[PDB]
Design a protein around this ligand. Structure first.
Ligand SMILES: Nc1ncnc2c1ncn2[C@@H]1O[C@H](COP(=O)(O)O)[C@@H](O)[C@H]1O
Length: 558
């Protein structure tokens, strides 16, 4: 029983953790990295705790670049590297490369196998229908040494764990051919058409991130005309060039006019509230992450779903799959993730290795940074995630996701940190300085009033700059932002043009006075992003003199 496995693992947290670390060290304690730490082959917890330092990405990057450039000696593991999983987190504007090994796919597959067993406890009958999940592959590259680098889900979807899988609780409408198609449009359109045809078997709707599902809905808003047509005519549109997709959908696309009729009846109305249960009326819930930065999207999802529950099922990363939500139907505000003690060796830094707290021993109410040791040879690596213990499941702590440290803005997988944002502001002022203008202060917000959302930067200038020049400032900020952002702009369409709102002189002084109604004066520092979803965003907006948008896409190529 998957459920009994969860109960055993969480009952025996600290014993499992010891055994896992023994397995990892049995595998790796003889690698270059651990030998350099002086472990000298020890596989026991006391030796490890004593000798292995806590590290960040930049401490490991020298080892990673050696592997990327073709070093195939056992640097990090006696299981050598199979590919690089590209985190959406960056350093110097480039994606961090998380080495993985072939063995880890099986542990990822184990975590996935736990999800529907838990869900089935709260939502009956899912086996009697399909899931409409919009899933997408993104671009791959190769390192100078020949290894592939690509996102974990892209790796997942192109793996046979996924392609040739044995299961009624995983009956999906999307043909893997459409999932694997490069082009966002063809992939989206083809998956929409298959979701609509099968509209009535659809018991749940989803995508990895809430924003992905929102972009699927916007896609419908823009293409239901041709969609209703191909449904009626039963003929695949020739916008779809990709021959492998055409063959997958045309394999289930049946001519159906009673179907096409309704699609027009619901999408012709200008009102799209509850559109999801109107097109897919047996939908029981939405399977999308809406914790952390995706929380922004909850109101928008509710409007389109008509109030359907939103399941946040899993907590995972490019470097390590962590665990799962044992209460997937709770309220989004109530989500906590139970880290699974078999997935790696997990330690916690209260927000140096002597302060590390073991998984079993974290304290309810406290916030910690996640520090992980993995089979792939990450050793006391800091993920950057801040977590708050909300309680315990048997001996296993449960965590509310707080944030990834230093991340200011995300629309999707982009994770723009304060350093990149500040440098972006500095690069755009080359357009301002000839006017005699400079940016006295700025802040930002992720704006999701439309799909896709976009970055809004507030500028208080000191000197007038014309509107075309300020729009070019938007573009320049985008050129300076990281590869994930620009890729999302040019390739995915998941982020719309960046917006600069110029605020009147004295605006940030006011922003100070409003927070001071609370905050400590000689403790205040201007927030570089604002989320207090009404009061502070409303105050800034109320001081805006003009608004400007990037008139063109930034540069990006894989
Ligand atoms: N429910 C969630 N599941 C996975 N990642 C999350 C969640 N909420 C926030 N995140 C962030 O997403 C990161 C994974 O980034 P990546 O390695 O690009 O997949 C995590 O380390 C978290 O900071």
């Amino acid at each position: 029983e998957k459920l009994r496995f969860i109960d055993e693992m969480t009952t025996n947290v600290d014993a499992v953790q010891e055994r896992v670390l023994g397995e990892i060290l049995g595998r790796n304690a003889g690698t270059e990295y651990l030998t350099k730490c002086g472990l000298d082959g020890a596989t026991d917890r006391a030796a490890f705790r004593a000798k292995v330092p806590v590290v960040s990405y930049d401490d490991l990057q020298p080892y990673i670049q050696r592997i990327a450039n073709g070093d195939r000696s056992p640097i990090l593991s006696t299981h050598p590297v199979s590919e690089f999983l590209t985190s959406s987190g960056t350093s110097a504007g480039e994606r961090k490369l998380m080495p993985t090994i072939m063995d880890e796919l099986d542990r990822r597959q184990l975590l996935y196998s736990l999800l529907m067993p838990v869900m089935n406890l709260y939502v009956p009958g899912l086996d009697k229908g399909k899931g409409l999940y919009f899933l997408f592959v993104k671009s791959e590259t190769k390192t100078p040494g020949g290894l592939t680098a690509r996102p974990v889900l892209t790796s997942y979807y192109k793996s046979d764990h996924f392609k040739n899988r044995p299961d009624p609780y995983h009956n999906y409408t999307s043909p893997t051919a459409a999932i694997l198609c490069a082009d966002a449009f063809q992939s989206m359109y083809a998956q929409m058409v298959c979701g609509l045809c099968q509209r009535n078997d659809v018991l749940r709707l989803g995508a990895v991130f809430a924003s992905g599902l929102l972009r699927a809905i916007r896609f419908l808003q823009l293409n239901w005309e041709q969609l209703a047509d191909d449904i009626e005519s039963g003929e695949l549109t020739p916008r779809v060039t990709d021959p492998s997709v055409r063959e997958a959908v045309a394999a289930i696309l049946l001519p159906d006019p009673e179907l096409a009729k309704l699609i027009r009846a619901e999408c012709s109305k200008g009102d799209w509230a509850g559109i999801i249960t109107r097109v897919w009326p047996n939908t029981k819930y939405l399977d999308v992450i809406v914790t952390g930065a995706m929380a922004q999207y909850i109101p928008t999802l509710e409007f389109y779903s008509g109030g359907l529950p939103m399941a946040c099922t899993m907590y995972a990363s490019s470097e390590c799959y962590f665990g799962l939500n044992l209460r997937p139907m709770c309220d989004p505000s109530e989500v906590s993730y139970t880290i699974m003690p078999n997935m790696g060796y997990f330690e916690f830094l209260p927000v140096d290795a002597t302060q590390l707290v073991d998984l079993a021993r974290v304290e309810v109410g406290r916030e910690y940074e996640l520090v992980i040791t993995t089979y792939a040879g990450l050793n006391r690596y800091r993920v950057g995630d801040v977590l708050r213990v909300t309680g315990f499941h048997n001996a296993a702590p449960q965590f509310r996701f707080v944030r990834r440290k230093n991340v200011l803005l995300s629309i999707e997988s982009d994770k723009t940190d304060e350093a990149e944002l500040q440098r972006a502001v500095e690069r755009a002022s080359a357009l301002l300085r000839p006017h005699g203008a400079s940016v006295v202060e700025y802040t930002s917000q992720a704006c999701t009033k439309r799909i896709p959302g976009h970055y809004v930067i507030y500028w208080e200038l000191l000197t007038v700059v014309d509107a075309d020049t300020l729009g070019r400032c938007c573009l320049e900020m985008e050129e300076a932002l990281n590869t994930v952002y620009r890729q999302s702009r040019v390739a995915d369409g998941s982020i719309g043009p960046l917006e600069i709102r110029v605020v009147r002189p004295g605006t940030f002084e006011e922003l100070m006075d409003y927070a001071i109604s609370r905050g400590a004066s000689i403790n205040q520092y201007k927030v570089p992003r604002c989320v207090t979803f009404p009061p502070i965003v409303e105050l800034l907006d109320s001081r805006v003199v003009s608004s400007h948008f990037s008139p063109a896409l930034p540069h990006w190529t894989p």
